Design a protein around this ligand. Structure first.
Ligand SMILES: *[C@@H]1O[C@H](CO)[C@@H](O)[C@H](O)[C@H]1NC(C)=O
Ligand SMILES: *[C@@H]1O[C@H](CO)[C@@H](O)[C@H](O)[C@H]1NC(C)=O
Lengths: 9, 274, 266, 98
């Protein structure tokens, strides 16, 4: 189950 | 026993050769089960193992939505990276990410990971406590400050403890005959002489799953640490490995190859004979 | 399929410069004269259009030499838009240029000049400009570009352009730029005044390590100082009004924290 | 920039027997960055229909790929793997050894 990756460096 | 789920993603800029390219793969243990590739026509998450193929359409819609979101995020992080490292827009760069979790034999959470690399080097990583970050250089110190100011470790912790472990357990049941299987190595030895006074004994292991294994050579008990090759995929879901040693002619009987693997009831002690 | 790209940008002022590069494995250029090589069949090898004129405006594909065949299939489409051919439109942000993360904003482009098409371009993005048909009302032509849901990728400096009916790729001079800023989700800082709000200096402090603070009245910019007690502060010297301030980090000038709580100077 | 040359291993899925259907594998690993050129050669000629796995990497962040194609070996047929990489000035050829 993929993770929500929303945070920019 | 213990198990793990990992998602690996690679972002590559290629100015003048293509739009930035994003590839993600999901693994359970040594067994790949999904991929998404930006340059491909589907533009969605695809099954790469038979046992995930019966997830319903809403699963694939949900997973495609998330990995496409990741694709956009990591392509902006390439741009940000140019600013942090004060690099020019003509170069090609690589941004890699890994996240996932381990469970023990009882299905309980053991470990979670959420890390990034830039140009083949550590960038930032979620610490074991799932509450703080390890920044590998001054650029990541910026990201670290941002992520602390956003309190984002909380979202990682909720995913790793909840969503990730829940999925791993579901897959272990879905692919039980394949994920919780245990294929023992088929073993043999080759012999080739190098010179008039030396010869090569190679101990072979083929057809085994999982990929973890120990090949060791002992000459009269003491391990003569030898040539080891990296464990390689056969392409069918099993792996292969060999270990070779150079031996004085007339001494092949003193040398024994030792094989340790979870598929073996008892470790194997192989001795060459013509 | 060859990959065609323009460098540094496909949106280029008249008199500027743009290079068409065609990456394959010598190449020829085409314009949407689909089978007619441009420049009477020139083999570009190393296309540096310079200075760019309005004749360079167009929708381009390339093919590269392929001896074991003798050319490749056509490349991807790159639309070169030449700017600076009409008076500039106006760009307006509704409700405003400060956009809460995840929310939406309308960027409205309008003009007394009667433009058939409007283009919206974020500065420094290689993406194709967004295009909308100009709608006519009360002596002006206008277009509402919807931007969002807001996130870092959508923040930055925007300009909009107009074009006329028979020269759709010949754009007007750019509107004055508009900075669109995404606020959140970083933790909001605290606003205070020295000696106080009735009168002055406004202090912005926070436990988070902002490198810059931005004071906005119902903007202004200053570098934070490490100060002490582990607090990053900045002091903005000033008829009063409603003030907020936002934290910001190095190399990210268009992404700010949640706003501080409002403070009223009277 | 860190840069890693690929390790190369050429081998068969199953023990090679002349006349028997099989798979020829080339496993490249430990390289960075990820762009790499891999060709399976038969008597110096590139074999068509070569497949490869999805790009992945290890804890060191170094990349690995498996290239494979169906093939029936014969005593007269010499197979090889040709690898090109930024870290290689000339393409590297590794022969299959039965
Ligand atoms: C440019 O040309 C291509 C095909 O030649 C077409 O599909 C495309 O819509 C044209 N315009 C733009 C703005 O890309
Ligand atoms: C564009 O959006 C504004 C909101 O700021 C609205 O008032 C206006 O009527 C819209 N334009 C049209 C043609 O509806």
């Amino acid at each position: 189950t993929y993770q929500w990756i929303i945070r920019n460096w | 026993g213990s198990h793990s789920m990992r998602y690996f993603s690679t972002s590559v800029s290629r100015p003048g050769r293509g739009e930035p390219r994003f590839i993600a793969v999901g693994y359970v243990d040594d067994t790949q089960f999904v991929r998404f590739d930006s340059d491909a026509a589907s533009q969605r998450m695809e099954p790469r193992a038979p046992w995930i193929e019966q997830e319903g359409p809403e699963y694939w819609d949900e997973e495609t939505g998330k990995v496409k979101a990741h694709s956009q995020t990591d392509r902006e992080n390439l741009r940000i990276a140019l600013r942090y490292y004060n690099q020019s827009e003509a170069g090609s760069h690589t941004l890699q990410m890994m996240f996932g979790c381990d469970v023990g034999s009882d299905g309980r959470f053991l470990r979670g990971y959420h890390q990034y690399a830039y140009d083949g080097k550590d960038y930032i990583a979620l610490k074991e406590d799932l509450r703080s970050w390890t920044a590998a250089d001054m650029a990541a110190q910026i990201t670290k400050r941002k992520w602390e100011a956003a309190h984002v470790a909380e979202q990682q912790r909720a995913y790793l403890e909840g969503t990730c472990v829940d999925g791993l357990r579901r897959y272990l049941e879905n692919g039980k005959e394949t994920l919780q299987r245990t294929d023992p190595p088929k073993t043999h030895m080759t012999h080739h002489p190098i010179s008039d006074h030396e010869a090569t004994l190679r101990c072979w292991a083929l057809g085994f799953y999982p990929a973890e294994i120990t090949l060791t050579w002992q000459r009269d008990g003491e391990d003569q640490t030898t040539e080891l090759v990296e464990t390689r995929p056969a392409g069918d879901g099993t792996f292969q490995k060999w270990a070779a040693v150079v031996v004085p002619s007339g001494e092949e009987q003193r040398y024994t190859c030792h094989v340790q693997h979870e598929g073996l009831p008892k470790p194997l002690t192989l001795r060459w004979e013509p | 399929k060859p990959f065609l790209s323009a460098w540094p940008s496909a949106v280029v002022p008249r008199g500027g410069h743009v290079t068409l590069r065609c990456h394959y494995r010598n190449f020829m250029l085409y314009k949407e004269r689909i089978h007619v090589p441009i420049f009477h069949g020139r083999l570009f090898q190393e296309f540096n259009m310079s200075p760019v004129t309005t004749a360079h405006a167009g929708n381009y594909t390339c093919r590269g030499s392929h001896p074991h065949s003798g050319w490749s299939a056509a490349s991807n489409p790159v639309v070169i838009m030449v700017t600076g051919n009409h008076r500039k439109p106006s760009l307006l942000a509704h409700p405003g240029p400060l956009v809460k993360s995840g929310e939406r904003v309308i960027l409205q482009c309008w003009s007394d000049i009667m433009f058939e098409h409007f283009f919206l371009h974020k500065e420094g993005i290689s993406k194709d400009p967004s295009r909308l048909v100009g709608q006519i009302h009360d002596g002006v032509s206008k277009a509402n570009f919807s931007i969002g849901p807001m996130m870092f990728a959508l923040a930055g400096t925007y300009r909009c352009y107009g074009s006329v009916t028979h020269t759709p790729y010949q754009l007007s001079a750019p509107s004055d730029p508009l900075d669109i800023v995404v606020t959140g989700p970083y933790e909001k800082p605290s606003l205070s005044a020295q000696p106080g709000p009735k009168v002055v200096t406004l202090s912005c402090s926070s436990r988070s390590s902002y490198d810059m603070y931005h004071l906005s009245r119902e903007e202004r910019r200053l570098p934070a100082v490490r100060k002490v007690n582990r607090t990053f502060q900045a002091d903005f010297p000033l008829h009063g009004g409603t003030y907020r301030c936002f934290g910001s980090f190095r190399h990210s000038p268009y992404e700010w924290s949640d706003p501080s709580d409002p403070l009223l100077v009277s | 920039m860190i840069q890693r040359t690929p390790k190369i291993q050429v081998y068969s899925r199953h023990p090679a027997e002349n006349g028997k259907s099989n798979f020829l594998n080339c496993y490249v690993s430990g390289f960075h960055p990820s762009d790499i050129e891999v060709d399976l050669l038969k008597n110096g000629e590139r074999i068509e229909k070569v497949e490869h796995s999805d790009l992945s990497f290890s804890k060191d962040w170094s990349f690995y790929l498996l290239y494979y194609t169906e093939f029936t070996p014969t005593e007269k047929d010499e197979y090889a793997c040709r690898v090109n990489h930024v870290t290689l000035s000339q393409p590297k050829i590794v022969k299959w050894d039965r």
